Design a protein around this ligand. Structure first.
Ligand SMILES: [Mg+2]
Lengths: 258, 267, 231, 185, 35, 258, 231, 35
């Protein structure tokens, strides 16, 4: 019908508006935000700790720093790099062996439907092993805490300080999984899917939120540091957004035409 | 009594050996709501398609064996003009609508004298591909004249010859042995049927509703019913009686719903 | 004492979309309130209804409008199949929310806008053909389908609502399948009378196309999305 | 070969498809006329049918009571089914390869019959199996019952010289089969 | 209510399961109002 | 008694109609349609995926196509071939090794009692392993969806895209089974046991319904593609028709007399 | 806290016919309605009651009728044992539903039809013998059993309802067992008086046989079917 | 009710367990009526 799209509001018509027709019956409510993000999906495949770690030092990290990379999973749909939140998402195309390949992550199923700016939800974290008969454990520390990185000698065995704490270290049975729901613990009222301000941090970068995360999990093996194995064991972190709310509609990513 | 004239539109038909109208699955198969899979207004019945369409069918000789059938698809006989069966203003509307939802009402006439014996099994057989050669393509009017009556072979009893897809050069072609559009010729009386015996009647009367996997089906590519005249007892007579009695049929669509108007169907 | 149970065959199975909760770990967290934020998306069909631009290959530099030549031809000025996997629908909010689903149901609403000069006068025929064996190109082959004539005047937009004509109640939102002349048919913008411009006005004005969803456009069955936006 | 063949065989690979339903009374007359003409004990013959299952109706035998018992079975064969001509050739390929392991330089001859020619997905394998049987050392003749493309049987046989209509077939194969009998030992 | 079929029985309390907001003191409305 | 079977309706008599007798008491209701199809039976033995698959390309498939056959189980009582719905059912009698032997299936217990034309029911799928100590997983995609066939590199391990999704991937415990009931998800109102129309698809073939299925399951092993084993592992798919309804009586298959 | 259970010996057992549900996976699916479809089979005994044809070996080309010769003989014109595994019952709906079960109970209803000319007059005796040591062949040996005389006239069908005479309440539907003269006895169609035809009428008319189920035919105990229809 | 002995307690709701039809707006009857 006769309209003005320069107005900015176009009323959603039906077939009966211009023609002779009828309204179709409403099919289903699967587009509900609380329904559509309330399902699990893979976030990041992280290695499993076998000793007391060294958490990745903040950027710009110089060479020679003996730290432990690819062990901590900053639980965020936004793009991360080296277990710390980033802006751009980078994947290595031809990863030659000069320098440390930084473990990046992103929630591919989220941004293809993240047609909004702010998003708040609880987080159900399921940590599925990627190793036959792995008895692991899933430590965690909230948004705004740091990793306790040393070891205390119990009975001539370097038991690290990430076995205990006031934060949930769920121990898995052998051949089992770990699943627990994390509350919204960040200091921001919502998580910015898209952020345009500047974080007044270690040198300020536009478009990088400081506390848009549910925390950081890491997997360790419940043995002291003398019982260290040799081969590298991985674990996979699935994530479900319980009780999702979303505000302020925005864009969906640019699907190319080639 | 047994004299029922079935007036419909401007075309009425008489019978004086009427067994009764075998209404199928319901009391009144004319009652039919519109399709629920359309958001436009359907073209309902009107008084130029609410009438019978007599068309011929091949003669029934002594050479016909037992179980030799002869299939007349509905609406597939309106569109290929099978047996001189011009659809009139129904086919002129069926080509111009995309979906069509009707229930049929047929009547097969075959006049046997009291000195003939034989029993046709007329039945409205749903969802069969009996008009299609074991090689996909549908039968033209020449191939219905080149055989006159399709013999119930083992390929029809097992469903071995229903149309398939060419798997291509990659897959080794499997030995096809069965397909679900078979005819079990002994169990055709489960369908809405009457027997056209040579000593009780000369006209069977079947009235079927719309059935189909969707609430309305496509117009060009549906075969949800199939008229199926099957010989249970072969014709026999002494030399002097009227050889080769003709078989006709008379199809009337009860309560159609045409949805999705477009121009006349060009392949 | 012990309640005698009998655990099923799906014991200790992790199913990703189990419609159920799980054990808390770190509860009794009062979160800071979000009463101040306006504009909450209660439902993602509040965004398919917002009209977004389409993308037409010009006569990765695509164009949201249709340049209208001054040369007479009896073919549609632009024509595109009504399929929400078609590349004139990748970057709409209708076709990029629905490509992350498996079924849809209802009315796509194609909004036009004549972005030419104010002194232009013309008419456009707007035909939606249902799926035929051949795409209609002649104006007389598209006059017979579902059309509507749009007269350019003071108000400069027209919302042609494409009907939902389909046998199945929910159409497949992604026709990447062994393909034919594609259901659900073709939209086509025919220029009926030529655009008569006064002297010293630009030739070839531009019809900016939109694509929203109707008031009865409904989606069903989430699927895993294509992650190829990130490569 | 200049060395004579120690054995000499014959394969009647016969179609019983739905296309030969009105022509089986002519195909059966062609087979009996070639069996009751070559009564030599040097020649063994086998009856292979195919519609959907390629089935050996009689193994590679020479006993004229068994062949008469074989020909009394071919008269009562109901046509019908598809045309899997590759599985007609696989039953002969299981018999050529079994008889190449005797130390006898024999000579396999294959006679094919077809009305309804094959689809592209079936012609690809029947051309493949006919290449397989020639690699096993056979001479494929393609006798044609009514209207048939010679090109669809040019690949199946040795060449276009080895494809024959059925009315000329016994006129052709009178001395064509007999030419290797004098060549043999 | 979300993707939650447990209409019958919540074992854990609402504060432990969910995360309620602390206090400061159908009909799909449009996201833009022409006035 | 005196009757007319040309009428087409014969009233079901008893012994008391012609003779002196009595009605026998009604035995049981095991002929009820909702009772008689509500029991599990084997459908198809499918191989278990060990890498990111290539779904079978539609017919006519030409030679040289590197695809993965015999892994997908199109969950349908109607005859299938190469994980796609077919009309005829073909079994290989003497399967020589020229060409790819296409995995066909059929529900033998269904058609011997499918004396009807249309049939609608839910579907309980139990996927029993045919391998000692197999830890597998049962992916699925509905009637009208396609398989997501690639791999995303998590931690230098080609984890395929069939680990995640919005459709149920049930993971089995080791030595265990997977059982879940699928709803009626096809776009057709019922499933045609016998269909006579033509599917206007890739070239149209009479008697072949396009969406007469409950979906397609496939079994995969939850390891990345670098942990690929050598031997072929099978799994067996049992199927139960919950809440069955059936319409429009029809024929039962021709039992031969030889 | 923990409810102390005690799982039984049949824990983690997959039984195929457990009378119970299981866990959903992909629920909240509204299916499109089937209110339009007529003729719903509520019960498979709505189809045993529909009379289907039998198959008699003529004097895999079998014949649903009995050709009636003009030659006198004091043996039954056709005779077949009342056993639903007998090959005159394989392709009825009575004998092909019941062969997929294990027991039956009630009255088989054999419907006849004289498909000869209208001018034929004759009578047929229709004897059901219970299981004797010897099958009755003489008309005088079959006059004594459960018989009924059918006079050919205007109405051309006769529904001889076979009684359910058996000790056990449910007979076995499949007598493939170490066999004798088979319970449950023999049906037998004797021609009582010869069919007197006027001149220029065909000799040997045809009695088309049917086989339905009674109004008290009841089935029990499903078994796995014979899958030999597919080979 | 089918092959279902659970007369007592349905854990999952009817929409999640079964699949109900959406809205459009004993005595064994015969399948053929002679009229
Ligand atoms: Mg042929």
């Amino acid at each position: 019908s006769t309209d003005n799209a320069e107005t900015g509001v176009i009323e959603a018509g039906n077939t009966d508006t211009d023609f002779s027709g009828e309204l179709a019956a409403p099919g289903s409510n699967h587009t509900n935000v609380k329904f559509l993000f309330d399902r699990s999906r893979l976030l990041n495949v992280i290695k499993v700790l076998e000793k007391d770690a060294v958490f990745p030092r903040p950027f710009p990290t110089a060479t020679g720093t003996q730290q432990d990379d690819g062990y901590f999973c900053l639980l965020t749909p936004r793009p991360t790099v080296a277990s710390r939140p980033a802006t751009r998402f980078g994947l290595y195309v031809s990863p030659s062996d000069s320098g440390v390949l930084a473990n990046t992550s992103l929630d591919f199923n989220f941004y293809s439907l993240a047609c909004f700016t702010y998003f708040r939800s609880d987080l159900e974290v399921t940590v599925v092993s990627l190793e036959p008969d792995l008895e692991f454990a899933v430590g965690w520390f909230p948004s705004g805490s740091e990793y306790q990185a040393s070891s205390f000698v119990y009975d001539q065995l370097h038991v690290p300080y990430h076995f205990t704490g006031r934060t949930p270290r769920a121990f898995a049975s052998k051949g089992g999984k770990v699943s627990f729901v994390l509350p919204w613990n960040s200091v921001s009222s919502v998580l910015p899917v898209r952020w345009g301000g500047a974080s007044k941090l270690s040198s300020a970068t536009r478009g990088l939120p400081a506390h848009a995360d549910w925390g950081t999990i890491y997997a360790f093996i419940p043995r002291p540091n003398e019982k260290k194995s040799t081969a590298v064991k991985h674990v996979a972190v699935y994530i479900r957004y319980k009780n999702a709310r979303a505000w302020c509609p925005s864009m969906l990513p640019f699907r190319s035409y080639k | 009594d047994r004299v029922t004239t079935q007036t419909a539109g401007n075309t009425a038909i008489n019978t004086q050996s009427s067994l009764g109208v075998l209404c199928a699955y319901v009391e009144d198969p004319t009652k039919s709501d519109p399709p629920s899979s359309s958001t436009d207004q359907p073209t309902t019945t009107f008084t130029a398609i609410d009438r019978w369409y007599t068309g011929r069918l091949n003669s029934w000789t002594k050479a016909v064996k037992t179980f030799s059938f002869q299939a007349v698809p509905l609406p597939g006989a309106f569109l290929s003009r099978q047996g001189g069966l011009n659809g009139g203003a129904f086919t002129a509307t069926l080509h111009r609508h995309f979906l069509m939802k009707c229930g049929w009402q047929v009547q097969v006439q075959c006049n046997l004298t009291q000195f003939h014996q034989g029993a046709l099994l007329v039945a409205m057989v749903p969802e069969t591909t009996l008009d299609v050669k074991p090689d996909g393509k549908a039968k033209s009017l020449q191939e219905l004249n080149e055989e006159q009556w399709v013999e119930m072979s083992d390929d029809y009893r097992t469903g071995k010859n229903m149309p398939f897809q060419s798997l291509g050069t990659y897959y080794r072609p499997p030995n096809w042995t069965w397909g679900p559009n078979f005819i079990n010729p002994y169990q055709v009386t489960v369908f809405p049927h009457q027997i056209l015996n040579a000593r009780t009647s000369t006209s069977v009367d079947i009235n079927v509703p719309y059935i189909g996997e969707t609430p309305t089906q496509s117009s060009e590519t549906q075969n949800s019913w199939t008229l199926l005249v099957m010989v249970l007892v072969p014709l026999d007579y002494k030399e002097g009686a009227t050889t080769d009695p003709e078989i006709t049929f008379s199809v009337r669509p009860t309560s159609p719903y045409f949805n999705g108007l477009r121009n006349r169907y060009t392949t | 004492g012990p309640i005698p149970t009998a655990p099923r065959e799906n014991s200790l199975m992790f199913l990703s979309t189990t419609p159920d909760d799980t054990v808390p770990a770190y509860g009794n967290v009062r979160t800071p309130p979000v009463n101040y934020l306006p504009g909450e998306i209660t439902d993602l069909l509040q965004l398919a209804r917002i009209p977004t631009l389409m993308a037409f290959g010009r006569v990765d530099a695509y164009v949201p409008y249709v340049a209208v030549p001054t040369q007479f031809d009896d073919k549609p000025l632009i024509s595109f199949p009504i399929t929400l996997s078609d590349p004139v629908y990748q970057n709409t909010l209708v076709g990029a929310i629905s490509s992350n689903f498996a079924n849809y149901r209802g009315c796509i609403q194609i909004t036009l806008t004549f972005c030419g000069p104010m002194m232009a006068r013309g008419k456009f025929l707007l035909s939606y053909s249902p799926p035929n064996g051949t795409q209609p190109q002649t104006l007389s082959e598209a006059m017979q389908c579902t059309y509507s004539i749009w007269d350019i005047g003071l108000n400069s937009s027209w919302t042609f609502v494409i009907p939902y004509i389909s046998p199945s109640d929910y159409r497949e939102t992604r026709a990447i399948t062994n393909s034919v002349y594609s259901a659900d048919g073709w939209f086509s913008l025919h220029k009926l009378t030529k655009i008569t411009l006064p002297p010293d006005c630009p030739q070839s004005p531009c019809i900016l196309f939109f694509a929203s969803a109707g008031e009865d456009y409904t989606l069903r069955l989430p699927v895993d999305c294509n992650p190829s936006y990130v490569f | 070969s200049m060395a004579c063949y120690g054995g000499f065989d014959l394969y009647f690979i016969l179609d019983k498809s739905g296309s030969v339903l009105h022509h089986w009374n002519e195909i059966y007359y062609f087979v009996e006329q070639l069996a009751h003409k070559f009564i030599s004990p040097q020649l063994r013959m086998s009856f292979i049918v195919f519609s959907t299952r390629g089935t050996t109706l009689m193994k590679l035998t020479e006993d004229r009571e068994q062949i008469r018992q074989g020909l009394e079975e071919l008269q009562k064969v109901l046509p019908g089914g598809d045309t899997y001509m590759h599985e007609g050739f696989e039953r002969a390929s299981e018999q050529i390869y079994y008889e190449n392991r005797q130390g006898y330089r024999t000579a396999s001859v294959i006679i094919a019959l077809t009305d309804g020619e094959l689809h592209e997905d079936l012609f690809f394998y029947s051309e493949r199996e006919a290449n397989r049987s020639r690699d096993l050392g056979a001479i494929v003749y393609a006798v044609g019952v009514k209207d048939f493309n010679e090109t669809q049987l040019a690949r199946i046989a040795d060449s276009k010289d080895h494809v024959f209509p059925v009315n000329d077939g016994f006129q052709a194969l009178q001395g064509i089969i007999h030419s290797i009998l004098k060549k043999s030992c | 209510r979300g993707n939650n079929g447990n209409m019958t029985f919540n074992y854990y309390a609402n504060t432990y399961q969910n995360s309620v907001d602390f206090s400061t003191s159908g009909i799909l409305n449009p996201l833009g109002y022409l006035k």
